[PDB]
Amino acid sequence: SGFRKMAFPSGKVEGCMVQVTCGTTTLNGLWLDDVVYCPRHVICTSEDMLNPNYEDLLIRKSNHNFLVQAGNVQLRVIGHSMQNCVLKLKVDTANPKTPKYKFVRIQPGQTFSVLACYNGSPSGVYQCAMRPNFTIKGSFLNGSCGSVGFNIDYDCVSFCYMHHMELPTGVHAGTDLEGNFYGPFVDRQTAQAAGTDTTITVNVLAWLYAAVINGDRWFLNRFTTTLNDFNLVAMKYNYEPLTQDHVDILGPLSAQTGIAVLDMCASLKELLQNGMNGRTILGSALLEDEFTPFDVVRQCSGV
């Protein structure tokens, strides 16, 4: 029993984190085989950061301008190149701890674990979701840039996020490992803002299914509803539309609990309309939307 915001074990990723220094900028890099991946902004100064021309700044640098430290050991950079907003530093040593891995791009609503690091040294792990507005609600200070997000899908690490920046509202923006930003953000100091966010409906329902599995049942009712009527209600409360695809994905949890998705939607309707009336669900007074259906099945049945 019990239901907790749970990260993947971070050990396979810990053994890939290095420190990358360029001039006075120090930040974190990801060492896989003989390449170190990090945010290209490592090459910028303050002034540069206002309106950087990355191509131009990069061509001015030698390999030996990049100092890469794996624990105590320096790695020799033998090559450098850019892909979108990430810098790829070729090094002379392949990482002996390289796990089986892929680079994947995740969709808004999907969750991942973040290993937060400072000076190439991992300090913390937490669970996040990609918000509909393509930000993440992370916990990051100066020095965190180049920290990464991942899922573990078997023994295979799927890298999905690299941290680049904080927005003025204190949320976080970054790229996939091919250097493409999530969201309409750029790596320069101009005015940027998170767009207005929405609640991830399918995740809230998943968490309601988790609560029932853990014995928390007071919000169930005798009512059912249609997709359309529900979606009318979702839109009103700044919830994402729910699709048939979502309904399909919740199938397992529906079968296990005997609550049809549209039945559970009737529950969520009521919560949105009436509130919680002083009650909690799994110890929360708000509806949690950072657990996927997969997350719930993984934690409430298996390893």
Ligand X SMILES: O=C(NCc1cccnc1)N1CCc2c(F)cccc21
Residues that bind ligand X (CB under 6 A): 1, 41, 140-142, 144-145, 164-166, 172, 187-189
115 binds, among its own copies, ligand X, Na ion, none (CB under 5 to 8 A by kind): its own copies
In the bound complex, what is the minimum distance in angstroms from residue 166's beta carbon to ligand X?
Answer: 3
Task: Give kind and range of the element (H or E) at residue 250.
Answer: helix 244-257
41 binds, among its own copies, Na ion, ligand X, none (CB under 5 to 8 A by kind): ligand X
In the bound complex, what is the minimum distance in angstroms from residue 135's beta carbon to ligand X?
Answer: 12
Closer by beta carbon to Na ion, 266 or else 296: 266
Closer by beta carbon to Na ion, 107 or else 228: 228
Task: Give kind and range of the element (H or E) at residue 233.
Answer: helix 227-236
In the bound complex, what is the minimum distance in angstroms from residue 9's beta carbon to ligand X?
Answer: 18
| Surface-to-core class of residue 170, CB atoms within 10 Å of its CB (0-12 exposed, 13-18 middle, 19+ buried) | exposed
Tell me how far apart the alpha carbons of residues 79 and 134 are, in angstroms, rounded to a whole number: 32
Closer by beta carbon to its own copies, 54 or else 150: 150
223 binds, among its own copies, ligand X, Na ion, none (CB under 5 to 8 A by kind): Na ion
In the bound complex, what is the minimum distance in angstroms from residue 47's beta carbon to ligand X?
Answer: 13
In the bound complex, what is the minimum distance in angstroms from residue 239's beta carbon to ligand X?
Answer: 28
Residues that bind its own copies (CB under 8 A): 1-12, 14-15, 115-119, 121-126, 128, 137-141, 143, 166, 170-172, 214-215, 280, 283-286, 299, 301-303
> Which residues in 76-193 belong to E strands, given as ranges?
77-83, 86-91, 101-103, 111-118, 121-129, 148-152, 157-166, 172-175
Closest residue to ligand X, based on beta-carbon distance:
165
Interacting positions 127-166 with Na ion (CB under 5 A)? none
Alpha helix ranges (H) inside 38-90:
46-50, 54-59
User: Three-state SS for 243?
Assistant: coil
Closer by beta carbon to its own copies, 90 or else 298: 298
- The sign of the dihedral angle between the CA atoms of 150, 125, 114, 196 is positive
Closer by beta carbon to Na ion, 178 or else 270: 270
Residues annotated catalytic, as ranges: 41, 145
User: Three-state SS for 269?
Assistant: helix
Interacting positions 259-288 with Na ion (CB under 5 A)? 263, 266
Interacting positions 217-236 with Na ion (CB under 5 A)? 221, 223
With CB under 5 A as the rule, give the number of residues binding Na ion.
Answer: 4
- Nearest Cα neighbor of 31 from 42, 20, 21, 23 is 20
| Terminal Cα-to-Cα distance of the chain (whole angstroms) | 14
261 binds, among ligand X, Na ion, its own copies, none (CB under 5 to 8 A by kind): none
- Nearest Cα neighbor of 184 from 145, 140, 135 is 135
In the bound complex, what is the minimum distance in angstroms from residue 276's beta carbon to ligand X?
Answer: 27
DSSP label at residue 284? B
- Nearest Cα neighbor of 115 from 150, 85, 164, 88 is 150
